[PDB]
Every structure is written in C-alpha cells, then in structure tokens.
Amino acid sequence: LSPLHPLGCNDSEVLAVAGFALQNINRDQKDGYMLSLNRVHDVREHYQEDMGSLFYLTLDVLETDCHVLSRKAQKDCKPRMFYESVYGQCKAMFHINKPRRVLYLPAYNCTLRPVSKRKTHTTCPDCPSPIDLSNPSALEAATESLAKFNSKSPSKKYELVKVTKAMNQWVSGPAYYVEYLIKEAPCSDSEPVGICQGSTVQEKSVTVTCEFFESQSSPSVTAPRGSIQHLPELDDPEEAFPVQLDLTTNPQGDTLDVSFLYLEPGDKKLVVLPFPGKEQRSAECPGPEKENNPLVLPP
Numbered sequence: 001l002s003p004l005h006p007l008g009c010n011d012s013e014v015l016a017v018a019g020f021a022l023q024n025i026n027r028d029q030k031d032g033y034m035l036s037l038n039r040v041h042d043v044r045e046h047y048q049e050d051m052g053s054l055f056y057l058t059l060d061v062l063e064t065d066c067h068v069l070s071r072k073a074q075k076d077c078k079p080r081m082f083y084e085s086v087y088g089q090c091k092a093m094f095h096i097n098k099p100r101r102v103l104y105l106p107a108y109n110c111t112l113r114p115v116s117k118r119k120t121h122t123t124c125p126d127c128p129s130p131i132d133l134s135n136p137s138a139l140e141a142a143t144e145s146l147a148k149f150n151s152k153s154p155s156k157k158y159e160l161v162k163v164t165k166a167m168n169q170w171v172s173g174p175a176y177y178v179e180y181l182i183k184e185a186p187c188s189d190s191e192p193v194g195i196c197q198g199s200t201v202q203e204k205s206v207t208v209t210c211e212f213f214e215s216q217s218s219p220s221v222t223a224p225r226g227s228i229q230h231l232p233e234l235d236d237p238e239e240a241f242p243v244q245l246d247l248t249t250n251p252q253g254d255t256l257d258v259s260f261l262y263l264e265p266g267d268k269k270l271v272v273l274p275f276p277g278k279e280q281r282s283a284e285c286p287g288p289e290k291e292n293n294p295l296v297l298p299p
C-alpha cells in the first residue's frame, strides 16, 4: 500500500528482523520441527515515526531435524537432507521500535509441503523414502523401540505420544526409521518429555535412543497467534505455498493496541494494513539463498 515501502531482501536490518521473526515463530510452536531461514522472499516496511516500524515479511524456510520442543539453538539444527526435505514459506508481521528496544510478532502464518517424491526419485532413486506416520510398520517400530527403552529403565517408564517422523529404506532387508515423542507413565503429567529415535531391520532387530527436553533466552521476546499448516506434495514457483495473513481486510488500515510492550499504560497503537501482494516488489527481492549445499536443497 502507499505507506508500505519496499525494502531489499539482502539488507542487514531486514535479515536480522527476519531471524528474530523466525525464532519467535519457532518458540510459539509446540508441534513439529524447528524451521530454518533460507532467504527473505519479500519485505515491506510501514514506518510510524514513534511507534517504530512494522515489517511485512515473506520468508523461504526449510525444516530442520530438531523438534520444536527441544528449543535448541538455531545453530545446532540444520536443514533435513534432500530426500526428506520439508520446505515452504512463512508470512510474518513483525514490529520493532529501536529507541524503545521493543520487539513483537503480532501475527504470522506458514505453509509447508514435503518435497515431491517424484523429484527425489529422479535425483536419488535408491534414497530412503518418507512414509505415512500411521504406517503399520512405523507404528510397530515405535512400539518395539519404546518397549526396549523401557526394558532398560529400572525405575522410570515412558509411554508413546505420537510418531512425528517415519522413513523406509533397505538395510540388508526392510528397515523402518521413526521418531516419536514420549511422556512419563503415570507414576508429572501427560506432557511430552522427550523425543526418541527407533529402528527395525529385517524376528526383527531393534535399536532405540532417546533425548529429553531441557530448558533453553535469545534476542526475541514474544510471538502471538499464528499457524503452521502442512499441505501435500506437488504432483506437477509463486503461490506454491499460499499463505493468508490478514489482520484487517480494510485498505484504510486498522489500529492494534500494543501498550503492554511499552512502559506507559495506554495510547500505544500500531497501524496494521492488509498484507501486501507480490507487485511493487524490490528488484533486490527475493534475496540470496543461504543454503547452497544440494544435499539439503529441494529441487
């Protein structure tokens, strides 16, 4: 819109604010895996001269192998390898006010898809393959791996919560690799306490390892309402990952009260517009991709 000024997707301020917004998104999640920033696809800034700025960000993201509940650092979590890749886009409306040292993510939304199995097969026909999380063999691997893990826990026993990842490959026979969350068995409540990796091969041979969540803080404070949705593969560009982020459908613009961020009690209102479309985009957008390793890139 008229007050929405486009910015270059490679600008330091833009990339820093994008990092803040994405770590806020990750903190706001309690399901799935931590997202990683590949680049800023587009960015518009609404400057408001004492209420700071509001950035309308379009982000190209990749799923890592860290579960969000691990709360690990962005630098201990790398994008998944290409045959199990999950990618898409997030839109975020991020508010920053430098003189007052205020950060806030009033709204976001992400749309992700797993990489097309056809493209994977084209580039690596013998690679491991993701499978449905409800696959009987995946559920069996989870069950038996957790059974073994409990067998070697004298006092504490754990129960399955949900399979979060499943994969099939050939290791001198059919093999299934799964990840799943575990909770403490009633003996404390029914909340995820860790994530386990389970495996079956070939009368099956079983392996199991578990990681328990610990506390973890970084340059990002709060992240209200938003959602991450997972759509199916592309059977076969722009609008491959449709994302709606409309706090207001009013071209006039609405006002959002953010007084809780500032020391004074009242009269701190932020102008919000409908999220800007792809036209009037800076020639420096989209920015340069950070992942150039084809071992982690989607086609």
Ligand SMILES: *[C@@H]1O[C@H](CO)[C@@H](O)[C@H](O)[C@H]1NC(C)=O
Residues within 6 Å of the ligand: 010, 012, 288
């Ligand atoms: C992006 O900015 C960095 C400096 O932070 C520069 O080294 C790099 O060449 C830029 N890439 C562009 C403009 O594509």
Ligand SMILES: *[C@@H]1O[C@H](CO)[C@@H](O)[C@H](O)[C@H]1NC(C)=O
Residues within 6 Å of the ligand: 107, 108, 109, 226, 227, 229, 244, 245, 246, 247
């Ligand atoms: C975020 O996406 C959901 C659909 O997954 C949609 O219902 C919701 O309105 C979106 N949020 C905004 C602020 O538009």
